[PDB]
């Protein structure tokens, strides 16, 4: 059975994280036209706030927002951990990195 | 300079931590079964007739 040699190159300080997105309303038919912007909290002194992040995705018609804090932050980001594996098919080596999962949702204000 | 959607993942790995089963010995009871009530040895009659 096909197997890969596992390596956690991972994050140098653990400060580095990749970014996974999941859309609450399904799959994006055209993810190529989306612009993602990652926002971080300016407060680096508060351990609670220093890991707060917002991911915004803008389309022509709607905006999506995901956050890793508050109601929008969901349980899967903690109870479980997410990683990204980059497999080199030639070497059979899989490099594994920490990942952060954002659940994306639509933007409207009264 | 922004973030763009990349190629779809080709596979998923789900990790869980699991221990294994031991041999079946099925040691039902310390002193097992319903041990039967029984005769005290010898006993002897504790009663006699008159005469």
């Amino acid at each position: 059975l096909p197997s890969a040699r596992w390596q956690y190159c991972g994050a140098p300080d653990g400060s580095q994280r990749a970014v996974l997105v999941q859309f609450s309303n399904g799959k994006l038919q055209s993810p190529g036209n989306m612009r993602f912007t990652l926002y971080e909290n300016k407060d680096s002194t508060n351990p609670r706030k220093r890991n707060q992040r917002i991911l915004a995705a803008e389309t022509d018609r709607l905006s999506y927002v995901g956050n890793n804090f508050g109601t929008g932050a969901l349980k899967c980001n903690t109870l479980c951990r997410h990683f990204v594996g980059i497999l080199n098919k030639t070497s059979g080596q899989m490099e594994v990195y920490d990942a952060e999962l954002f659940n994306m949702q639509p933007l409207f204000s009264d | 300079g922004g973030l763009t959607c990349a190629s779809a993942p080709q596979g998923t790995l789900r990790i869980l931590e699991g221990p294994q089963q031991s041999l079946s010995g099925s040691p039902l009871q310390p002193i097992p079964a319903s041990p039967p009530p029984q005769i005290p040895p010898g006993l002897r009659p504790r009663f006699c007739a008159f005469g």
Side-chain angles (χ1 to χ4, degrees):
Chain A
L1 296 173
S3 66
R5 190 170 71 169
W6 182 286
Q7 183 177 20
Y8 176 74
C9 305
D13 298 341
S15 298
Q16 182 89 37
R17 284 224 170 185
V19 179
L20 298 171
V21 298
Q22 185 179 35
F23 291 86
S24 57
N25 296 328
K27 187 178 177 181
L28 283 161
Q29 288 187 352
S30 303
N33 290 341
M34 291 186 174
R35 189 178 171 184
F36 297 86
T37 307
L38 184 64
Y39 302 88
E40 64 183 7
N41 192 295
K42 292 178 183 176
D43 191 348
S44 59
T45 60
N46 189 334
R48 189 176 179 178
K49 292 186 177 179
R50 70 177 177 187
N51 294 321
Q52 293 183 359
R53 302 180 182 193
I54 301 170
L55 186 65
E58 296 179 2
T59 73
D60 290 341
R61 296 185 178 190
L62 105 100
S63 299
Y64 297 82
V65 175
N67 53 267
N68 67 350
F69 63 96
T71 58
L74 280 198
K75 309 274 193 166
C76 228
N77 226 12
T78 61
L79 293 183
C80 59
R81 293 180 71 179
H82 299 84
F83 306 87
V84 173
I86 305 172
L87 176 67
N88 187 313
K89 294 182 289 181
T90 302
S91 70
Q93 188 175 8
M94 183 178 290
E95 298 178 355
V96 181
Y97 302 88
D98 292 325
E100 191 171 2
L101 179 66
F102 290 84
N103 293 321
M104 304 299 290
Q105 265 253 325
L107 210 273
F108 318 109
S109 64
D110 54 312
Chain B
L3 300 172
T4 189
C5 276
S7 300
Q10 288 66 0
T12 303
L13 295 176
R14 211 269 243 73
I15 302 170
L16 42 141
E17 177 210 81
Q20 295 177 335
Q21 293 177 335
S22 65
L23 294 174
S24 65
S26 64
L28 352 91
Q29 290 282 294
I31 160 179
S34 315
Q38 55 193 359
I39 319 288
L43 282 184
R44 230 188 75 262
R46 303 242 169 263
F47 172 74
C48 61
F50 51 90

